[PDB]
Nucleic acid binder design. Structure first.
Ligand SMILES: [Mg+2]
Ligand SMILES: [Mg+2]
Ligand SMILES: [Mg+2]
Ligand SMILES: [Mg+2]
Ligand SMILES: [Mg+2]
Ligand SMILES: [Mg+2]
Ligand SMILES: [Mg+2]
Ligand SMILES: [Mg+2]
Ligand SMILES: [Mg+2]
Ligand SMILES: [Mg+2]
Ligand SMILES: [Zn+2]
Ligand SMILES: [Zn+2]
Lengths: 174, 82, 37, 55, 37, 177, 80, 43, 157
RNA sequence: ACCUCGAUGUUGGAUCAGGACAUCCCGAUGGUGCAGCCGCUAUUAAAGGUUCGUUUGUUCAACGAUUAAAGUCCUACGUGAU
RNA sequence: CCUACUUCACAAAGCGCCUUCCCCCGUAAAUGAUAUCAUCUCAACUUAGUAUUAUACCCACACCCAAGAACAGGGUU
């Protein structure tokens, strides 16, 4: 179908290769990241009614992986689709105008220069981190008597409530 | 024509008093369902608990097991009446 | 609290009931005189 | 004393007309006779009874 | 608009209007007479 | 009578499906009826330990009617738990957001505050509009009378009723009206 | 406004509206507001004919119009 | 919110108490009984 | 009832008034000597907001009330009729008496609305049990309406 | 002088702050002895913010330099099993 | 987040870089009755006046790991 206002097309699943500089004609540097589209294919399509959401959904799979390390159901699904199993499958909300047959490949040219895009990914896992690094708490002074308190959280709550509010910023996985 | 209650359901109530007025008699023959008011006879743990709750219109809680304490406290030979 | 207080002292519940029971009841003139000739 | 039909002109409950005493007493007698004939002919199975015993 | 518990018409042109649930003294010749309950 | 023990017990402790139509009905009266039926308090064999509740299906819950200015004055309050998470939403706003929350909350409040309340709410079924699922419709057994009789509009009043109602005054002939 | 003419038959009833309209329009304040504006309160059903400065005519038959309505229409047409 | 200072029903600032129609009727009934008592003691 | 009709012909606009047919009070009122229509027809305390057949007789074609000097109503019954008319309009029982002239507003069914919907603030802080902020229902002007129930009307909820 | 003296650790600061609005700044609005710029006053608004230093243990105060502003409070005068 | 610079060096960081998107209501006005004027309207009503936030995100042995206290998670073609 031709493009119409209010239409949302499918995206891709790329692989973060790295970063490099890129200079514009005004002599300004910009750090630009490299996203490589590695074996990106449409895998599944569910219509508005089928998914019950406000928009249809297209599943897109990327970074083909070994068939020996995938669940039997996933292997069956990919065998029926006719493609090797992909590392990640993500769901894109689209209008019915942008429906694409499952199995079709997607390419980096799907986007074009000058466009503006949104990129979602799992952030670098820093594990169980202290309050200072996780929430940028000031911490306590290094000297002037401080006994065994340099990076600990201060008061976590007030005395009256006699509890800790849900959502309190505490040390934990970051 | 007056009827204290509708006679379209259950028995047909008819109240009376004996001549002395010292006892009330009630005649309540049961009403049979009319043939015209009738139709012809037609011719994992988490998912399991969710399915059972959907089936029986209950909550998930009752379908979880109980500890040995409660299981052995339960009386397996309860008294039976009638 | 003294018998005479700067504020309206709270009455004992029985006294409150007594006052409510002994409130003034105006005479109701059956048919309202406004719409009688 | 006429009142035009409004939501409050008449009581919400329906108006009930009780049977006239003479005809109703005749019906009372007829029903009592019917039940008495049932008892005479033994047209009853189990009988239950509310009985005041002790207290 | 000044908040007043008692509203007074401060000139001939002031008028009382009950708007958005409360009384207002509005005035066009002397806007400073504008009062809100 | 004359039934076998198990069929008799099944018939006695069977759960019935009732239908309420919430069109122009007070959510409170709807909730009272629904709570009675859900608890099973309408059964002579009722007992809190007998699990004698019945299914209640309320349709047209989107078209409930509030008496007075409750649409703007009644406030539904909740707390997400997090600091600053106190949300107070008026009845109109809550109705516009969820067309079932008003009746659901009314029934939840009227139900007893014990561990059977959530089971009773599971037995409860609410639908914003006339549409009902086919399985629920087949399950339906009885339709309860609407607690509030809907007053008739002038457009709905028949000419016979208008003629029957007398003219109460002679308007002046030379009045612009 | 250019000219205003009011005609009526006083011996015939239903002339109070037009008579009060005549009194109000001829009130000295209006004539001082527009001295150039000319009133011709003839009399001989009752009618009021107003010719404006733009050569536009308003005709108010005050048989069944109250003075307030006639004056409101007159002011509205003045505003134009 | 909506606190009664100190203890309810005793302090200067007590929790307000309001008489219901039920209580009014009860008191009126007792008053009627006592009026009849006055009458029967007056002879 | 007279109606004002204006016709623009050329540049000479005419405007006249014609007296159309007018309703007449039904013959033989049940209670003659009643000083006003309501007390004359024995309706002093026997009508409510939903009695549109009664209310519309005191209604301008666009929903406005009629003056006392014209209707003949006593002051108390005029106030009662005005409040009942407001409640009926807010409940939607007068669909043919709408204001003269609309974006689609949300449709919330109402009845017995004392206040204008847009002039009441939400009760965010309802008081304690002894000082609860209650939501008015109906009108106090009808507190004396005939009560067929043992309990009186609850004007505040 | 009602709980606590077979212990409820109590100034100021650090840390983290939750909350109220009787709003210091940012938003909208009425009045003005509102020409404009500054202001003053009142209604609504608590989403966000509300500085760094010299002396002083100071909370505060003064002073220096700023800021859109450098708010008033409650929280065991919040928070010493941090 | 690490392409540069910096601490530094298979990486973690800032002193470095990148992205950050909607309201809220107090009043100001139209038409218009009660009260044929007028009146912004706890009259019916028309606008500034919007929330019902919208969209976004997520949705299937053993060894190594940008995943991690353990567990869990990703890869092993
Ligand atoms: Mg440090
Ligand atoms: Mg030490
Ligand atoms: Mg140390
Ligand atoms: Mg206390
Ligand atoms: Mg002591
Ligand atoms: Mg003492
Ligand atoms: Mg101890
Ligand atoms: Mg404020
Ligand atoms: Mg103190
Ligand atoms: Mg007007
Ligand atoms: Zn003034
Ligand atoms: Zn009267």
């Amino acid at each position: 179908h031709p493009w119409e206002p209010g239409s949302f097309r499918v995206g891709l699943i790329a692989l973060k290769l790295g970063m490099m500089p890129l200079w514009t004609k005004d002599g300004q540097k910009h750090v630009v990241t490299l996203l490589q589209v590695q074996d990106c294919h449409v895998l599944k399509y569910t219509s508005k009614e089928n998914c019950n959401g406000k928009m249809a959904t297209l599943s897109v799979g990327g970074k083909t992986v070994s068939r020996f390390r995938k669940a039997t159901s996933i292997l069956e699904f990919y065998r029926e689709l006719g493609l090797p199993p992909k590392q990640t499958v993500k769901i894109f909300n689209i209008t019915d105008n942008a429906a694409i047959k499952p199995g079709t490949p997607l390419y980096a040219a799907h986007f074009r220069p000058g466009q503006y895009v949104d990129v979602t990914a799992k952030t670098i896992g820093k594990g169980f981190q202290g309050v200072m690094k996780r929430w940028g708490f000031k911490g306590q002074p290094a000297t002037h008597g401080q006994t065994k308190t340099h990076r600990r959280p201060g008061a976590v709550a007030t005395g009256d409530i006699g509890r800790v509010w849900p959502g309190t910023k505490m040390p934990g996985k970051m | 024509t007056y009827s204290p209650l509708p006679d379209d359901y259950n028995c047909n109530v008819e109240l009376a008093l004996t001549s002395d007025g010292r006892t009330i008699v009630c005649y309540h023959p049961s009403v049979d369902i009319p043939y015209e008011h009738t139709k012809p006879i037609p011719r994992e743990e988490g998912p399991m608990i969710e399915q059972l709750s959907k089936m029986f219109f209950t909550t998930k809680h009752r379908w979880y097991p109980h500890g040995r304490y409660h299981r052995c406290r339960k009386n397996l030979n309860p008294p039976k009446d009638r | 609290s003294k018998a005479v207080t700067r504020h309206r002292r709270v009455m004992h519940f029985q006294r409150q009931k007594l006052m409510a029971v002994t409130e003034y009841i105006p005479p109701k003139p059956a048919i309202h005189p406004s719409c009688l000739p | 004393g006429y009142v035009p039909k409004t939501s409050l002109s008449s009581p919400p409950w329906p108006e009930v007309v009780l049977p006239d005493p003479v005809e109703e007493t005749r019906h009372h007698a007829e029903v009592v006779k019917k039940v008495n004939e049932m008892i005479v002919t033994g047209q009853y199975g189990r009988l239950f009874a509310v009985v005041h015993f002790a207290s | 608009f000044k908040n007043k518990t008692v509203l007074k018409k401060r000139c001939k042109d002031c008028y009382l209007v009950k708007r958005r649930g409360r009384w207002y003294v509005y005035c066009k010749t002397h806007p400073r007479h504008k009062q809100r309950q | 009578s004359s039934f076998s023990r198990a069929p008799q017990q099944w018939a006695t402790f069977a759960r019935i499906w009732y239908l309420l139509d919430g069109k122009m009905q007070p959510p409170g009266k709807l909730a009272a009826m629904a709570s009675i039926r859900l608890q099973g308090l309408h059964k002579p064999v009722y007992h809190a330990l007998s699990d004698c509740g019945d299914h209640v299906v309320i349709m047209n819950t989107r078209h409930i009617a509030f008496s007075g200015n409750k649409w703007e004055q009644k406030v539904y309050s909740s707390h997400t738990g997090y600091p600053g998470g106190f949300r107070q939403v008026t009845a109109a706003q809550l109705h516009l957001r969820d067309p079932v929350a008003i009746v659901k909350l009314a029934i939840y409040g009227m139900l007893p505050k014990n561990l059977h309340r959530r089971t009773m709410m599971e037995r409860l079924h609410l639908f914003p509009d006339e549409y009902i699922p086919e399985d629920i419709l087949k399950n339906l057994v009885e339709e309860l009378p609407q607690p509030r009789k809907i007053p008739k509009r002038l457009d709905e009043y028949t000419q016979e009723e208008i003629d029957a109602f007398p003219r109460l005054w002679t308007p002046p002939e030379d009045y612009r009206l | 406004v250019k000219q205003v003419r009011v005609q009526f038959c006083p011996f015939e009833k239903n002339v109070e509206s037009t008579r009060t309209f005549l009194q109000t329009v001829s009130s000295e304040k209006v004539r001082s507001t527009n001295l150039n504006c000319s009133v011709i309160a003839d009399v001989r059903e009752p009618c009021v004919d107003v010719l404006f400065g733009d050569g536009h005519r308003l005709i108010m038959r005050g048989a069944h119009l109250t003075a307030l309505e006639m004056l409101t229409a007159f002011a509205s047409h003045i505003r134009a | 919110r909506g606190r009664i200072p100190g203890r309810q029903w005793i302090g200067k600032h007590r929790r307000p108490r309001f008489v219901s129609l039920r209580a009014k009727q009860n008191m009126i009934r007792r008053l009627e009984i006592e009026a009849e008592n006055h009458y029967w003691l007056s002879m | 009832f007279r109606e004002v009709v204006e016709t623009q012909e050329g540049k000479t606009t005419i405007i006249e008034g014609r007296i159309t047919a007018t309703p007449k009070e039904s013959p033989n009122p049940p209670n003659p000597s009643g000083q006003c229509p309501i007390c004359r027809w024995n309706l002093k305390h026997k009508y409510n907001y939903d009695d549109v057949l009664l209310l519309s007789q005191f209604i301008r074609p666009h929903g406005g009330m009629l003056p006392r000097k014209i209707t003949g109503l006593c002051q108390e019954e005029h106030r009662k009729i005005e409040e009942c008319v407001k409640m009926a309009h807010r409940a939607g029982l007068l669909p043919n008496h709408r204001p003269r002239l609309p974006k689609s507003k949300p449709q919330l069914n109402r009845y017995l609305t004392r206040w204008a919907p847009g002039s009441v603030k939400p009760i965010y802080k309802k008081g304690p049990r002894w000082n609860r902020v209650r939501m008015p229902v109906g009108s106090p002007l009808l507190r004396d309406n005939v009560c067929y129930s043992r309990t009186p009307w609850k004007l505040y909820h």
